[PDB]
């Protein structure tokens, strides 16, 4: 177990068939969780579960370029629960990130940042106890 925020290095960036696994537990009072796949200061892919946005639970995905947030992609399917252990898996595919939570497909996010081999850090932050963060090639 690790204390958030945590940066996982992705040396040489990401590549299709790379599977990133984040294990941890949602804190009881949780408000938010964030994963940030970074290319330098740009955020190629921000994955942001919000537990109470206007009293609704939503997943917000976006990209940050030149320090400006782009167009949000939102999903109301919400597989996280306060207090519960989770597994987020991010599968890098040629044209998108694919996310599954607790072994159920959640969403796909098309690559806006094209230079996958420069997406060299994953930030993990928010209302979680982080158990582990690793990757493998499938
Ligand atoms: C309030 O800040 C968030 C951003 N955010 C979250 C965290 C954050 C930090 C720490 C933790 Cl621990 C954690 F979980 C976290 F989510 N930091 N920045 C990010 O979620 C962003 C995504 O679009 O929305 C907001 C910022 C935003 C969005 N938009 C417009 C709205 O429509 C189009 C464009 F997007 N302008 N600004």
Swiss-Prot record:
Binding site for a beta-D-galactoside: 69-75
Motif (Nuclear export signal): 114-129
Domain Galectin: residue ranges: 6-136
PTM annotation (Phosphoserine): residues: 76
Predominant subcellular localization, coarse grouping: cytoplasm
Location(s) in or outside the cell: Cytoplasm; Nucleus; Secreted
GO biological process, one term: positive regulation of protein-containing complex assembly
Tissue: A major expression is found in the colonic epithelium. It is also abundant in the activated macrophages. Expressed in fetal membranes.
A single cellular component GO annotation: immunological synapse
Gene Ontology molecular function, alphabetical: carbohydrate binding; chemoattractant activity; disaccharide binding; IgE binding; laminin binding; molecular condensate scaffold activity; protein phosphatase binding; protein phosphatase inhibitor activity
Keyword vocabulary terms for this entry: Acetylation, Cytoplasm, Differentiation, Disulfide bond, IgE-binding protein, Immunity, Innate immunity, Lectin, mRNA processing, mRNA splicing, Nucleus, Phosphoprotein, Repeat, Secreted, Spliceosome
Function: Galactose-specific lectin which binds IgE. May mediate with the alpha-3, beta-1 integrin the stimulation by CSPG4 of endothelial cells migration. Together with DMBT1, required for terminal differentiation of columnar epithelial cells during early embryogenesis. In the nucleus: acts as a pre-mRNA splicing factor. Involved in acute inflammatory responses including neutrophil activation and adhesion, chemoattraction of monocytes macrophages, opsonization of apoptotic neutrophils, and activation of mast cells.
Subunit architecture: Probably forms homo- or heterodimers. Interacts with DMBT1. Interacts with CD6 and ALCAM. Forms a complex with the ITGA3, ITGB1 and CSPG4. Interacts with LGALS3BP, LYPD3, ZFTRAF1 and UACA. Interacts with TRIM16; this interaction mediates autophagy of damage endomembranes. Interacts with cargo receptor TMED10; the interaction mediates the translocation from the cytoplasm into the ERGIC (endoplasmic reticulum-Golgi intermediate compartment) and thereby secretion.
Name of the protein in its database record: Galectin-3
UniProt organism field: Homo sapiens (Human)
